[PDB]
XYZ file of C-alpha atoms in Angstrom:
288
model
C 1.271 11.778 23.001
C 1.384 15.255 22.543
C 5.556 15.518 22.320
C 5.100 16.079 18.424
C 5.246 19.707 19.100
C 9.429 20.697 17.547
C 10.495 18.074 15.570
C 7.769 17.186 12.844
C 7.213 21.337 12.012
C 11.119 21.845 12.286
C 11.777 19.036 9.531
C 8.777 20.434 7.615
C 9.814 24.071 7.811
C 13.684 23.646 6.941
C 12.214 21.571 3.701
C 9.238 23.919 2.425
C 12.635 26.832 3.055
C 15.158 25.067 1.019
C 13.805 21.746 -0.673
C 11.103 23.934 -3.362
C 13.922 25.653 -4.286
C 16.095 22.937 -4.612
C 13.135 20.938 -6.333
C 12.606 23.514 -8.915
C 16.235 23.336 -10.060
C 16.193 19.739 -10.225
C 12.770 19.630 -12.283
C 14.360 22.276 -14.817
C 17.468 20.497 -14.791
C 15.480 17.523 -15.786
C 13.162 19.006 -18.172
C 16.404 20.476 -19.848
C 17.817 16.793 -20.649
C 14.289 15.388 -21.812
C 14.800 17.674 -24.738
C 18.443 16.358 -25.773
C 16.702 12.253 -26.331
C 17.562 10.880 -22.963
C 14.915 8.883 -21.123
C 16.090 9.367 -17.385
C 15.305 12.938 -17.701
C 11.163 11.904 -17.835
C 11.881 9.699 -14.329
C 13.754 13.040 -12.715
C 10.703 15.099 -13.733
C 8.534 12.886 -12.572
C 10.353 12.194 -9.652
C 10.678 16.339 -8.431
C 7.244 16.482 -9.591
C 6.013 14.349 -6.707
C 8.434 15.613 -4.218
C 6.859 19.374 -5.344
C 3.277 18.209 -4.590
C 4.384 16.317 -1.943
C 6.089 19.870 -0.421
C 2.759 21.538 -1.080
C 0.585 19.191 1.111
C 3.289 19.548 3.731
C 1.923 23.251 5.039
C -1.231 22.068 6.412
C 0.407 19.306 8.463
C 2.475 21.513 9.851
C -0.192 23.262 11.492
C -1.622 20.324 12.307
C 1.179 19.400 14.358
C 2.098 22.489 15.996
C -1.630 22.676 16.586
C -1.550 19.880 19.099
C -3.047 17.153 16.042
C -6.580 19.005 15.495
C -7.675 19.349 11.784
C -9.036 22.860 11.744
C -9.216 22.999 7.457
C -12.898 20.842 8.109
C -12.821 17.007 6.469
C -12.243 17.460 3.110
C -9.169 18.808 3.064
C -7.665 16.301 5.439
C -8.571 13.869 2.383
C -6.959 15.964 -0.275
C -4.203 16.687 1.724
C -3.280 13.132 3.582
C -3.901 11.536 -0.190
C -1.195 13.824 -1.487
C 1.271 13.421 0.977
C 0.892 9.328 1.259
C 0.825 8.906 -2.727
C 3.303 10.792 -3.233
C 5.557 9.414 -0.523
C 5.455 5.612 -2.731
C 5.463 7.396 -5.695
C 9.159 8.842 -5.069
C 10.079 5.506 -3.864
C 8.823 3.734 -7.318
C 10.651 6.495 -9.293
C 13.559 6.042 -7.989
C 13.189 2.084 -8.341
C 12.766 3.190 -12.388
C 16.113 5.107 -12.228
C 17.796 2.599 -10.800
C 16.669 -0.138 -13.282
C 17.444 2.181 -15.864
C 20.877 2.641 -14.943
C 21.706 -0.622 -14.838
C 20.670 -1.507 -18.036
C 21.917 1.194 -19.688
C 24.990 -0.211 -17.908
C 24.952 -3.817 -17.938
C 23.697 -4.382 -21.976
C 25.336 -0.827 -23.276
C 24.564 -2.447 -27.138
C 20.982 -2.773 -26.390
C 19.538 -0.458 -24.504
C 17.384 1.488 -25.182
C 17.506 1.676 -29.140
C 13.745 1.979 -30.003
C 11.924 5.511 -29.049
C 12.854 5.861 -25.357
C 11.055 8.769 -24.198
C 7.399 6.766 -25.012
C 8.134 3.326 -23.195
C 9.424 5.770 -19.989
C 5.985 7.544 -19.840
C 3.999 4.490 -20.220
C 5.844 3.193 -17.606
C 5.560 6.524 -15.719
C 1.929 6.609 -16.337
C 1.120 3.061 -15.754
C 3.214 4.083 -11.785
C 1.187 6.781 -10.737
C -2.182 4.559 -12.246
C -1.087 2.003 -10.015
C -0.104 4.372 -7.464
C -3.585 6.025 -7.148
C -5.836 2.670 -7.225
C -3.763 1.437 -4.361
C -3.992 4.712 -1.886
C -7.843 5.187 -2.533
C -9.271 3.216 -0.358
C -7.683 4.912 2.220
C -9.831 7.851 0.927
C -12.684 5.703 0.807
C -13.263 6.193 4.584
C -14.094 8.299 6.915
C -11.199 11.020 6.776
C -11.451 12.302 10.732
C -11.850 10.535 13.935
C -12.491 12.901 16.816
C -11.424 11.558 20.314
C -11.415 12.977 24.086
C -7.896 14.185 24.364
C -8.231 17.235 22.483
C -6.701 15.427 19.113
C -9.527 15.200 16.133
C -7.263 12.973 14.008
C -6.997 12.906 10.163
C -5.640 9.963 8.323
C -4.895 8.055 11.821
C -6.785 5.286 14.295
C -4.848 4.563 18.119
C -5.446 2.100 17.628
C -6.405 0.676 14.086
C -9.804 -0.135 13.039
C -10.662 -3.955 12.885
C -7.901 -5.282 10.222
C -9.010 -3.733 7.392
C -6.436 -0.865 7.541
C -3.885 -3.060 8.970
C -3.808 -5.588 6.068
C -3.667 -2.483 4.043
C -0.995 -1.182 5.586
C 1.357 -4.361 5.696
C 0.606 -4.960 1.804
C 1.510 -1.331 1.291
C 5.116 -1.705 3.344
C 5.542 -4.789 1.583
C 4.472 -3.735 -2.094
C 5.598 -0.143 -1.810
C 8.781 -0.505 -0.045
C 10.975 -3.379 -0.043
C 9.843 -4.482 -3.295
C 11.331 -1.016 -5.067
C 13.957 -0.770 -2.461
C 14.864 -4.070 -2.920
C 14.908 -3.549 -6.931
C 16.856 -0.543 -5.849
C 19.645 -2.272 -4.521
C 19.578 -5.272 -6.819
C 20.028 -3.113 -9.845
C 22.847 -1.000 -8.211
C 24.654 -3.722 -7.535
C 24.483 -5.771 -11.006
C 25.843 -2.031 -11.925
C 28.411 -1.895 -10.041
C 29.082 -5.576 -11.174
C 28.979 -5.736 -15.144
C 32.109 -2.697 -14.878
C 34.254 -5.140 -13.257
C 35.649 -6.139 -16.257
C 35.906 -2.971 -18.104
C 39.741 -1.997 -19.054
C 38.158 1.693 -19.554
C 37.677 2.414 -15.936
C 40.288 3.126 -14.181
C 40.192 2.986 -10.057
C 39.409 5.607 -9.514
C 36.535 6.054 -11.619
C 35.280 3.121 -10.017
C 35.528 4.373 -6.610
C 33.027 7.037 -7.421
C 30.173 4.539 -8.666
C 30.928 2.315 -5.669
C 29.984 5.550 -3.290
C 27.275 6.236 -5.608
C 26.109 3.347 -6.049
C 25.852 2.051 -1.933
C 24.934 5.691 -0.716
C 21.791 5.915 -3.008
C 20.098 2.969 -1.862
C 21.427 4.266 1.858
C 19.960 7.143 1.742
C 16.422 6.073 0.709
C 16.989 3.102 3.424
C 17.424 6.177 6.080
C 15.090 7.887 4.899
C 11.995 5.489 3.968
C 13.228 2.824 6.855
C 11.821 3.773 9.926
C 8.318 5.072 8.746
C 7.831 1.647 7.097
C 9.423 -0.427 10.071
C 7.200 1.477 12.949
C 4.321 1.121 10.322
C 5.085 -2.778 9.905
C 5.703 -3.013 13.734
C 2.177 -1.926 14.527
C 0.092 -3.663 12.307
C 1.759 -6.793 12.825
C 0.950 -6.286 16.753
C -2.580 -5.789 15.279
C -2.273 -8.727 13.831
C -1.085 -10.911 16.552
C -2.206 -4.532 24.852
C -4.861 -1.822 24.663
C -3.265 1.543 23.798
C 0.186 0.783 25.647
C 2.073 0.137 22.663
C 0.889 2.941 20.796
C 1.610 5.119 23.702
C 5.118 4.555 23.526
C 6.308 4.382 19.727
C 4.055 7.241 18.985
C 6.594 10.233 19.195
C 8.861 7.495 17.086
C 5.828 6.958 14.930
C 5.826 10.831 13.971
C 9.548 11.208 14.119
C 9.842 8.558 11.894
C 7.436 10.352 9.347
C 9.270 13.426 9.416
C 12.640 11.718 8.088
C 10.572 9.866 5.608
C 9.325 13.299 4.139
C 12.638 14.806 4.578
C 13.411 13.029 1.238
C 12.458 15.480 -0.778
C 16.055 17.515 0.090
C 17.924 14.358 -0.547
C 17.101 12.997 -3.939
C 17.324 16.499 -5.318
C 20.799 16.621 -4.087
C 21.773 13.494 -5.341
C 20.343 13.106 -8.798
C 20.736 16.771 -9.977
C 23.335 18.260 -8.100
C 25.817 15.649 -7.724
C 25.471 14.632 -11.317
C 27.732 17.029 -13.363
C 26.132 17.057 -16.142
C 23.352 18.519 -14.558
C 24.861 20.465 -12.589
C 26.254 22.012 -15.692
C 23.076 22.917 -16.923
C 22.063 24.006 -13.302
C 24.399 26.834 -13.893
C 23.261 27.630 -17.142
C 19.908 27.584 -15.524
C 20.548 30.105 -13.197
């Protein structure tokens, strides 16, 4: 422990310096397509929305990395701040599920979807997310938020090792139920996409090329990105489940590595879904 000093604050510096930028844009572009009827513009906003807060919370845990792992902001804000950051990390997750599933319908069944107000049924469904969202990741902030120990640490949000089952069922439901089961959506609905044009005399190959990259990168990236957060996370609970602190002592520095990937998402999917699209990318220059 204690090798956490470079890597987390590098990965958290190089995305408060370019990803709030790159997050406004995206949320304007967005917003700017919510106005002309279309119903993935309220999952983009959404989306950018939590990767804004989540870029926010990420200031204070950067100091309280570089800090050597004290929480010098006093208890309260290590709940407001770990409950942003973890709720908002599943919430991009679930968004992106949404914008997949939309896609493919609007897709597969082009002469019936949507049809009938789309805008509402997208923010119920966006509301009814972050509803389910919340009630999941506050027990978590039911507890006690820091746990002091000898070796000059004080965590926040953090037991080496767990406390008694009760946050390690927790945390295998959450991998399970908040990754996996969107991922797995994810893929499932980029694929039936990438299916129901295969068919189409319209698309030439070319054209299809581009949705086959699109298609297979998306759900790569968010693999790459969410994967090994949610695989260490899986790994230790399951051991829980099943050395003292040996294990922890070794996949820690992976633990926190792997934590810093999974946050540097917020770069990624405002690449991909405003940037790379060029229809909003259009607007991106009208925006500027």
């Amino acid at each position: 422990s204690g090798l956490d000093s470079v890597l987390p604050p590098s990965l958290y510096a190089l995305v408060f310096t370019l990803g709030l930028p790159a997050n406004l844009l995206a949320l304007w572009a967005a917003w700017l397509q919510v106005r002309k009827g279309r119903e993935l513009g309220v999952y983009l906003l959404n989306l950018s929305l939590s990767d804004l807060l989540l870029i926010c919370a990420l200031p204070p845990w950067t100091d309280y990395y570089l800090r050597r792992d004290v929480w010098g902001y006093g208890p309260g804000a290590c709940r407001l701040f770990g409950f942003v950051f973890y709720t908002n990390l599943y919430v991009g997750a679930a968004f992106l599920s949404c914008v997949s599933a939309d896609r493919y319908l609007a897709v597969a069944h082009p002469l019936r979807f949507p049809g009938a107000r789309p805008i509402r049924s997208a923010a119920a469904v966006s509301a009814l997310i972050w509803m389910l969202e919340l009630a999941a990741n506050a027990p978590p902030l039911l507890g006690e938020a820091i746990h002091r120990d000898r070796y000059n640490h004080t965590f926040c949000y953090e037991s080496y090792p767990l406390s008694g089952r009760g946050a390690a069922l927790a945390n295998v439901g959450r991998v399970l139920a908040g990754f996996l089961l969107p991922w797995g959506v994810m893929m499932l609905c980029y694929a039936g996409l990438l299916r129901a044009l295969r068919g189409s005399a319209s698309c030439e190959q070319r054209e299809r090329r581009r949705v086959r990259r699109l298609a297979l990168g998306l759900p790569c990236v968010a693999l790459l990105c969410y994967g090994p957060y949610h695989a260490l996370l899986l790994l230790r609970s399951l051991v829980f489940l099943v050395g003292g602190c040996a294990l922890e002592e070794r996949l820690f520095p992976a633990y926190h590595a792997s934590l810093a990937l999974a946050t540097l998402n917020c770069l990624a999917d405002p690449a991909l879904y405003c940037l790379a699209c060029p229809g909003a990318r259009g607007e991106v220059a009208k925006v500027v």
